[PDB]
Design a protein around this nucleic acid. Sequence first.
RNA 1: UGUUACUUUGAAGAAAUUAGAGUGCUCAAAGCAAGCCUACGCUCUGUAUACAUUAGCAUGGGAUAACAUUAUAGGA
RNA 2: GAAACUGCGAAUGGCUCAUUAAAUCAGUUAUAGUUUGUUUGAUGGUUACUCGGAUAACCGUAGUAAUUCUAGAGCUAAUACGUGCACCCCGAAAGGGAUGCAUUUAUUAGAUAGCGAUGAUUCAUGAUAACUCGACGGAUCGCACGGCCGCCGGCGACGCAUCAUUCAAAUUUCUGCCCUAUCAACUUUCGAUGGUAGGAUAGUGGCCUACCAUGGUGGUGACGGGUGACGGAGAAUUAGGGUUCGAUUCCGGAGAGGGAGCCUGAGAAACGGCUA
Lengths: 261, 147, 32, 184, 37
Amino acid sequence: ARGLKKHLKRLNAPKHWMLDKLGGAFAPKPSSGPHKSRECLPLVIILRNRLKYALTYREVISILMQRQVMVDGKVRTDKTYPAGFMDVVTIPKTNESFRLLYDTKGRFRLHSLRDEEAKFKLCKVRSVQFGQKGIPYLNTYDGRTIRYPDPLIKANDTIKLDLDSNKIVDFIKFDVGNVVMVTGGRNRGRVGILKNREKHKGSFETVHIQDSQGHEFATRLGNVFTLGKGSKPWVSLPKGKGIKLSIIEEARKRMAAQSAT
Amino acid sequence: AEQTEKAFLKQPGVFLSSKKTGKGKRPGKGGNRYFKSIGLGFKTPREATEGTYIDKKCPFTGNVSIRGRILAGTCHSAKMNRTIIVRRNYLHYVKKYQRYEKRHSNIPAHISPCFRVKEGDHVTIGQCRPLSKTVRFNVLKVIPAGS
Amino acid sequence: EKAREKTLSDQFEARRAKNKASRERKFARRKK
Amino acid sequence: GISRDSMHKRRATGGKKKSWRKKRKYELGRQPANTKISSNKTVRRIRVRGGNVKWRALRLDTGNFSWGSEAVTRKTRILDVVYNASNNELVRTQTLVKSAIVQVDAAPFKQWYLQHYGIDISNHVVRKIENRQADRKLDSHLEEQFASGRLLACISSRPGQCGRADGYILEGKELEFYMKKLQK
Amino acid sequence: KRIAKAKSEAADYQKLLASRLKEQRERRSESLAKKRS
RNA sequence: UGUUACUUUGAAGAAAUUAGAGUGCUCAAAGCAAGCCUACGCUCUGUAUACAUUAGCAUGGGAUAACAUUAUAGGA
RNA sequence: GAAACUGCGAAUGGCUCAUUAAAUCAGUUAUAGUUUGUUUGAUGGUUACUCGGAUAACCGUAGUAAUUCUAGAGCUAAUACGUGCACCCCGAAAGGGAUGCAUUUAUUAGAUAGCGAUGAUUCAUGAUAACUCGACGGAUCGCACGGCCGCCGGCGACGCAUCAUUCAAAUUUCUGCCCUAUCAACUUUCGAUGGUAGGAUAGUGGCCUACCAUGGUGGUGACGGGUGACGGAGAAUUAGGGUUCGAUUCCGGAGAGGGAGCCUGAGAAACGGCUA
Ligand SMILES: [K+]
Ligand SMILES: [K+]
Ligand SMILES: [K+]
Ligand SMILES: [K+]
Ligand SMILES: [K+]
Ligand SMILES: [K+]
Ligand SMILES: [K+]
Ligand SMILES: [Mg+2]
Ligand SMILES: [Mg+2]
Ligand SMILES: [Mg+2]
Ligand SMILES: [Mg+2]
Ligand SMILES: [Mg+2]
Ligand SMILES: [Mg+2]
Ligand SMILES: [Mg+2]
Ligand SMILES: [Mg+2]
Ligand SMILES: [Mg+2]
Ligand SMILES: [Mg+2]
Ligand SMILES: [Mg+2]
Ligand SMILES: [Mg+2]
Ligand SMILES: [Mg+2]
Ligand SMILES: [Mg+2]
Ligand SMILES: [Mg+2]
Ligand SMILES: [Mg+2]
Ligand SMILES: [Mg+2]
Ligand SMILES: [Mg+2]
Ligand SMILES: [Mg+2]
């Protein structure tokens, strides 16, 4: 190509969007924004495919152009705005407020929130370094830059960000014993306690996570996101609570549901 | 001395005409010879910390970082100036016959004056940025043949 | 180059013989 | 035009490379500046990749030169190119390139030396000048060329890239090395 | 507004750093008691 | 801290296709839907999972096998 | 609110498989080796109650067989164009110089085990001496009207610069490709392999120049030749192993009758752009 690609073929779109292959030749091309295009959920998918408020591509534009949808407390009018993990989506007219969290099968779930819990979000710290004039700053994995951070905050820590004051309220150091969620790979959406950190000089660092039921799984440091200090997350989790069930166990529940339901 | 080229060879950033003395200052400051550790558990040879050679492609006293793949092999050619050919021997799996065949690859690598090498010696090479048309590796350790 | 290998061979052959004398001396003292 | 691609080169084995695509704009080169010493200063502005700017100096006469041991930098006139390690033909053409040995006017540094040490090469003022004179040392080789009004200097900038000819005054064993190259 | 904001945030950060320099010294003082014991 | 092969487990790995779970498009090839009751709705509805040579990355195993090494020990 | 200026886009998409056999490409790396309009986040010092000259549409004299071929005259705009309010040193401690951001060079700090990061950087970043004839640091627009006694003030739009981020590219590590020896040596004056110093480039690099060295590849098949050869995801048939196919809708590459060259631009060696 001679420059930037503006189209996304439907079969090349991320699988966790769950787009039907015969729905059309194209999928929404995620706009540039805080999250990567492969780890986001464009507002058009949320409003039309997940919430059913819009029936067509055109109707999503009407909803957004009325300024009825907000992401992280700010109105967004871009149809392909890349809303991602921990983002807070608010729709004042419907009095609804959701947090984008992965279900245990690795797909984004619109977790309904209470009005009180919709005033903050969690962010993972990418790095901390000195800026111009020797002023320290930290940047996150959701594209945010915070100047004058607490000197104790380091890379891979999690910060609680208030969407009103736009300031760091509290932070969690990345250490063994905290509850974390997996944000990428095979184990995406699984919640457990960080049990070990295996460092390899020059290579990726591996982290061993143990589920509440004793199931242990590994992953890369880049796919970990601390949710709370100790064992209690600072955010509300969906029903599964990051517990991944075997297909045999899942089939057992389905069989029982038909007997009762 | 090491001044054998048409230009005067020196390390960048090491000021040699300072009125003050370099006694009690870190390498590369106060006119002291500059050297560094490359990490990954490799040791800085004594010949590079106390040497007088100038090599901007040296991994310990030059301006090149080691990052990427660390490979090992045997010195195949040591006839170039500060460059050797490293032969890497490996087995290629032939699927249909469920057997192996011996293959090899010649990897050019830069060798700093702090290392002594001869054909047949075992060498470890670390990847660096392109240093020439073919060289992408720097010698990090030499084990004499028969040791 | 020739001087480099001469010094190494000359010094190695020196201590290599000194150790032989020392070990034999130590053995002589251990018998008693 | 000028290209920096490897497609025209031979393989490391020696075999030829058959062409499989046309030249790309993102691998181009450009004509050398060939900066010369001349009082008719000329620097042309070049638009480069990303919309950024390079300054190509065709002719220069002054430069910003630093006396390292004294930690003083002054703008001074470039007088002559005397030595070039790459190509002696760049000396007689008076081409300004990085690492070329040139002679610069010593007048701006003499004024600072007289204002700083009170020496040629107000009660509270004389108090400090004599205080600074205790730790004053001047290289004999460096002082010998102040009489002629010219200092040997090395260009540390790239005039064809930044449009300027900056450098530092030679001293120490570097000065000895180059003055021996000029001793003929 | 932005000059005041930059000046305000710069002052708070310096107070935070100075506030914690006491801890590094006070905590150091009590830490030295173990050496004597 | 001699270097490897081999083996075990794991991570990373495009989708579509292939295998495969769920689902009565009337069946079917398919599709990714739908189902539940009859309210201003519900099931957080579903859209599983396996496979994926070789090379590379990381744990456990050390039989089999390759290379290297050994006595003027530059030995511990 | 036509027209017209200005802004942006037209570098995506679509089409095709000619050239191309460690090349493309695949998995796997690296950028501490670079550029990146936009998005998102943050950050930009202690005549001015508002400058200047043009030009389109329009208007009216036209030329040519002729083209979104073209000349002259009269008008008038701007977020067009050009301008412009906007600690250290010297020192009779007065006074003066420098004093935003960026640019270029040099000196200096960046410890230890006040003082940040990495497996690893004289790294992030600081201070200092100067430097540049710096498209920088708002002469812009909508809506709403209020509060103080002329002053002050709301919510937006557009635009400039820096860092981070996102969207990406470029180059790049390791391993892997069909037939042919009736192809055994190939490469190196004119770059072949490496070294030093430069030039050029967004940047690494014989990418190019000067000088120096004599290297580099090869029966583990180099070099050359053939392909009715784009590569892969895959397709057919398959007890197992395998054989054959893969122009074509997904990904990557390449081309626009053949070559070459280039402007504009964040991005093109662009072809529903230009020059030969
Ligand atoms: K491209
Ligand atoms: K454009
Ligand atoms: K690849
Ligand atoms: K291939
Ligand atoms: K380059
Ligand atoms: K070279
Ligand atoms: K543009
Ligand atoms: Mg295209
Ligand atoms: Mg790394
Ligand atoms: Mg227009
Ligand atoms: Mg061929
Ligand atoms: Mg290759
Ligand atoms: Mg620095
Ligand atoms: Mg070079
Ligand atoms: Mg040459
Ligand atoms: Mg084929
Ligand atoms: Mg063909
Ligand atoms: Mg094909
Ligand atoms: Mg064909
Ligand atoms: Mg067709
Ligand atoms: Mg294609
Ligand atoms: Mg093209
Ligand atoms: Mg045709
Ligand atoms: Mg063309
Ligand atoms: Mg056409
Ligand atoms: Mg086209």
